[PDB]
Amino acid sequence: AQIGPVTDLHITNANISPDGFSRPAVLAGGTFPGPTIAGNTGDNFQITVFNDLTDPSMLTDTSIHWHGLFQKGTNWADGPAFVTQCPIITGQSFDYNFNVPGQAGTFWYHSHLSTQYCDGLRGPFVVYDPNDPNASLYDVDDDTTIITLADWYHTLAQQEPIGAAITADATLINGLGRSFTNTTASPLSVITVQSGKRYRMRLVSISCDPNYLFSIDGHDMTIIEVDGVNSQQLTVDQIQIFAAQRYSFVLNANQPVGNYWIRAQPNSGGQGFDGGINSAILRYEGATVEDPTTTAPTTFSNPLVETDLHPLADLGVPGQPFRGGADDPLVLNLAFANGRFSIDGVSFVPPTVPVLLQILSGAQNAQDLLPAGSVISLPSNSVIEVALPAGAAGGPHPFHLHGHNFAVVQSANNATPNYVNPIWRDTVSIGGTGDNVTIRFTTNNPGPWFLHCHIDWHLEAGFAIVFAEDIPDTASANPVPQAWSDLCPAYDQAHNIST
């Protein structure tokens, strides 16, 4: 069952064996992935998070981010540790109480403390639209049509060297999959369809690092949503999905009744499908209960290309149709050396006092804010352009902005910008050497918004900056509850920190 929009959510430690190998984890709702949190557009969500963690090897503090939800007027509920809150300590709880006006689509939730989400705190978050403009394109859209893609590690995250190339041990599809080494024939996930029906498959990358080449043997996929943004219909036979991205696609169950492989090939870790790694099963009702015998093609003739995507609504692009044609045009210098990432020459290291609390306490320019050099102020009611030229080691890096979605004016592997009708999204691959992926948005949401690579090992190694949007209006726009004001005193007392 789905939970929400008003629900408790307990965060616990438990052993799990999703690939046949047992290890302890950090779990929401006792499962991997966590339960789906759901509601309708415009609903009030009140997710009371109970921190019941006791195993220090995965951190006993926590904080949860609601990925892709704008949090307008509720910046304090966004979740990134030391940007919008201090962590929740063990034995305490915290009500994330916010609203989702003007958004409907496929989202997710995850720990936003250190690399803790890698240790298991990740699940889907779906905001349905009772008047969805895409409703007539499918018959079925429910918890059974959500498909999660996850990387899974046998080593605990707090034992992963910072700045290292860290490689997973299994791909998990809907929580199940097989290990790349010492492979055992552990259970594969089954997605069941009825011949003749059409399904809204909600594809969610809950990855900490790899991108996946996702396909379904014998089937094609008609994209209708990108990171929460409704798209024109685009039919593809393969989707390369980067960490934290989401797509909805229509699956037409129009092939012969049978079993078909579902494939998710990561860019690192095990290559191919030997022993049923990187795999799940699409089973038609009435098919024999047996593994598929289907083949992938040698090459995919209609792969997703990001410039082929266009919004269903007339979203356009803010600003003027040339590079630098914005009120506040920025170019970030994105670099890596010696185990640490940097943005504009500064490697992100979380501050002692969360950025939001620094601003509420009266610090009101970005040079007064800590970490020094890690906070850029944005002016209110302005068009912002951010160029993100690639080249830093460990690519392709999927950059994500909190508090906003954005027009993708230039995409990976294509030097031509689009000022007319590009897709809008919230997480974007910045591509490869010489690319100049560029995003635009308007500043109508006061508060400090994190910008970072969504490969969680890279964030940990410093690949982040904070956009302090409309510092002067942050306090009036974001009144804070007493329980939020209580978090830093409690956290600092528990950890013997003075501030």
Ligand X SMILES: *[C@@H]1O[C@H](CO)[C@@H](O[C@@H]2O[C@H](CO)[C@@H](O)[C@H](O)[C@H]2NC(C)=O)[C@H](O)[C@H]1NC(C)=O
Q: Least Å distance between CB 300 and ligand X?
A: 15
Query: Which span sits near Cu ion by CB under 5 A: 204-212, 303-311, 317-325, 391-399?
Result: 391-399
Query: Is 320 a binder of Na ion (CB under 5 A)?
Result: no
Is residue 70 a contact point for Cu ion (CB under 5 A)?
no
Q: Amino acid identity, residue 326?
A: A
From CA 275, how far away is CA 81, in angstroms rounded?
40
- Tell me whether residue 352 or residue 421 sits nearer to ligand X (CB atom): 421
67 scored as a contact of Cu ion (CB under 5 A)? yes
Q: Binding residue per annotation — 404?
A: no
Instruction: State which of positions 62-101 bind ligand X (CB under 6 A).
Output: none
Least separation, in Å, of the C-beta of 434 and ligand X? 6
Query: How many residues make up the chain in this entry?
Result: 499
Partner whose footprint covers residue 389, from Na ion, Cu ion, ligand X, none (CB < 5 to 8 Å by kind): ligand X
Residue nearest to ligand X (CB): 324
- How would you write 275-334 as a 3-class SS string? HHCCEEEEEECCCCCCCCCCCCCCCCCCECCHHHCCECCCCCCCCCCCCCCCCEEEECCE
Name, in order, each residue with C-beta under 8 angstroms of 131's C-beta and a sequence gap of 6 or more. none
Token output for 31: 């499962």
Tell me which of 453, 461, 466, 471 binds Cu ion, using CB under 5 A. 453
Cis peptide before 130 (omega within 30 of 0): no
Q: Which residue has the tokens 């690639």?
A: 390
Cβ contact 369:359 at 8 Å? yes
274 to 49, 82, 171, 263, 297: CA distances (angstroms): 40, 43, 13, 12, 16
Which residues touch 232 (CB under 8 Å, ≥6 apart)? 309, 310, 311, 312
Q: Which of 414, 477, 483, 494 binds ligand X (CB under 6 A)?
A: 414
Residue 246 lies near Cu ion (rule: CB under 5 A) = no
Residue 436 touches ligand X, criterion: CB under 6 A: yes
Would residue 455 show up in a list of annotated catalytic residues for this protein? Answer: yes
458 binds, among Na ion, ligand X, Cu ion, none (CB under 5 to 8 A by kind): Cu ion
Query: What is the spatial distance between Cα 153 and Cα 140, in angstroms, rounded to a whole number?
Result: 33
Is residue 331 a contact residue for ligand X (CB under 6 A)?
Answer: yes
Q: Which is nearer to ligand X, 24 or 389 (CB)?
A: 389
The number of C-alpha atoms within 13 Å of 35 and in the hemisphere containing its C-beta is 16
Contacts to ligand X by CB under 6 A? 305, 307, 323-324, 329, 331, 387, 389, 414, 416, 418, 436, 438
Kindly list the catalytic residues. 65, 67, 110, 112, 397, 400, 402, 452-455, 458, 463
Contacts to Cu ion by CB under 5 A? 67, 80, 244, 397, 402, 450, 453, 455, 458
| Annotation: binding site for Cu(2+) | 65, 67, 110, 112, 397, 400, 402, 452-454, 458
